[PDB]
């Protein structure tokens, strides 16, 4: 199940039910392109990076020995955290490491100068076309 993110409105969500083979390592890789944001949309520390939320791993890990049905009112509190459905399987919810990714950043000190320069570039075309369309050729 995958839902796509919308800019400034939704995060990406990607859920998979993978069957891990015995004595193996399974690699789940997905490609991403970093996005350039507005100069006011960055954190106060914009060169530190942006944190990707840790991934959640839910599984029914097999057990060495079978567990008898437990009574939540007569058992230690650490044994009643998760409901147990099968004797030979127990439920674990692992969380992976947070990921620190850096986005490309604007200058943060160039809002006036960029406005001036881009406006000047536009005005170059404006003035040249205005001259060419308005004025007419004359001798001497």
């Amino acid at each position: 199940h995958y839902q796509p993110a919308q800019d400034r409105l939704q995060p990406h969500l990607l859920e998979m039910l993978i069957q891990l083979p015995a004595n193996s390592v399974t690699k789940v890789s997905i490609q991403f392109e970093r996005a350039l944001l507005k100069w006011t949309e960055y954190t106060p520390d914009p060169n530190h990076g942006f944190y990707v939320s840790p991934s959640v791993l839910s599984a029914l890990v097999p057990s060495m020995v079978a567990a008898k049905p437990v009574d939540w009112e007569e058992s230690p509190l650490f044994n009643s955290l998760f409901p147990v459905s099968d004797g030979s399987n127990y439920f674990v919810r692992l969380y992976t490491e947070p990921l620190l990714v850096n986005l490309p950043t604007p200058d943060f000190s160039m809002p006036y100068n960029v406005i001036c320069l881009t406006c000047t570039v536009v005005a170059v075309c404006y003035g040249s076309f205005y001259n060419l369309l308005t004025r007419t050729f004359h001798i001497e």
């Binding site: 006036y112 100068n113 001036c116 320069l117 000047t120 005005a123 170059v124 003035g127 001259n131």
Partner: peptide, 27 residues
């Protein structure tokens, strides 16, 4: 101490305005 964001009026506005007006319009 620190520096607030202030426009470089003399450095850039004058330059990028005198690159347009005397280059195209006035003369």
């Amino acid at each position: 101490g620190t520096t607030q964001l202030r426009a470089t009026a003399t450095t850039l506005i004058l330059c990028c305005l005198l690159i347009i007006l005397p280059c195209f319009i006035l003369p």
